[PDB]
Amino acid sequence: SGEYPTVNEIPVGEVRLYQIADGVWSHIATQSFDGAVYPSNGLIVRDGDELLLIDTAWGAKNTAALLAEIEKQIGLPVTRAVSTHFHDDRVGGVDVLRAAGVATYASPSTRRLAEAEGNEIPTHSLEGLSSSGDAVRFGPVELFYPGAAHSTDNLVVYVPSANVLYGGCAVHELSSTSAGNVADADLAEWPTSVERIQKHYPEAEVVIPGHGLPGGLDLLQHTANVVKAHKN
Ligand SMILES: C[C@@H](c1cccc2c(-c3ccc(NS(C)(=O)=O)c(F)c3)c(C(=O)O)[nH]c12)N1C[C@]2(C[C@@H](CN)C2)OC1=O
Ligand SMILES: [Zn+2]
Numbered sequence: 001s002g003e004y005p006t007v008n009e010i011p012v013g014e015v016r017l018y019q020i021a022d023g024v025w026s027h028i029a030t031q032s033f034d035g036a037v038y039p040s041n042g043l044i045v046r047d048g049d050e051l052l053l054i055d056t057a058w059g060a061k062n063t064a065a066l067l068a069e070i071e072k073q074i075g076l077p078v079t080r081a082v083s084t085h086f087h088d089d090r091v092g093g094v095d096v097l098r099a100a101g102v103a104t105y106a107s108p109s110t111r112r113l114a115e116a117e118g119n120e121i122p123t124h125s126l127e128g129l130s131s132s133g134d135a136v137r138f139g140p141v142e143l144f145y146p147g148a149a150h151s152t153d154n155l156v157v158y159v160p161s162a163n164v165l166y167g168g169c170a171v172h173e174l175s176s177t178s179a180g181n182v183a184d185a186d187l188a189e190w191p192t193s194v195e196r197i198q199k200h201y202p203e204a205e206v207v208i209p210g211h212g213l214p215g216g217l218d219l220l221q222h223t224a225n226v227v228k229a230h231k232n
């Protein structure tokens with residue numbers, strides 16, 4: 001009823017959208033992993049009479065439900081998708097997207113990691129993102145590689161029309177008291193990568209984490225703090 005959709009509020013398999021700004025939505029779905037249930041976010045950005053999708057809804061059936069929810073709530077076709085790192089909450093559902101005619105993209109680093117680990121593999125490689133601080137344009141967004149953080153390949157996404165910073169899993173929500181799933185993280189480099197985000201996007205008005213509630217720029221410093229506390 002208007003609040004940001006939450007883990008116990010979304011049954012696994014259902015997707016909800018949340019309007020962030022004009023032409024910008026997040027998508028929220030829930031999934032089970034190792035016997036616990038988690039929410040996750042992605043982004044939808046209007047691209048004229050088409051849509052750009054950022055990240056799957058964490059699973060094949062969730063991603064099919066995402067496409068149906070987009071058709072119900074927005075009614076414009078998803079033509080392209082970018083996955084922001086190689087984990088299943090970002091690429092699981094790429095096969096569904098590809099069979100729905102969506103062109104799927106990720107950095108070569110993400111594609112290699114997904115392939116090696118047995119996750120679904122986006123079709124098209126995004127060059128120009130291999131060095132920290134790199135940025136490229138992709139439709140209505142800028143893609144930025146901040147350096148290793150949650151994963152070595154993690155990308156962030158900025159929507160310049162709306163000053164929306166989608167941090168993906170390199171950014172945590174304010175209520176987080178831990179650093180999430182750090183299995184593939186670089187805890188030592190993560191604060192440096194967050195500092196690069198802060199320096200590059202000082203005008204961000206909304207910051208969206210990979211999991212949990214959006215907020216403002218405070219999410220960046222908070223993320224550095226929780227990561228340093230996990231490491232220390
Ligand atoms: C698929 C993904 C995965 C699965 C389950 C949970 C998460 C969380 C997570 C947990 C707790 C919080 N809340 S919090 C900050 O603690 O309070 C949060 F926000 C996010 C994250 C994330 O942090 O992005 N991602 C998860 N996977 C799986 C895996 C393990 C590797 C295989 N050995 C691949 O790594 C990974 O990320
Ligand atoms: Zn991850």
Ligand SMILES: [Zn+2]
Pocket residue numbers: 087089169210211
């Ligand atoms: Zn994640």
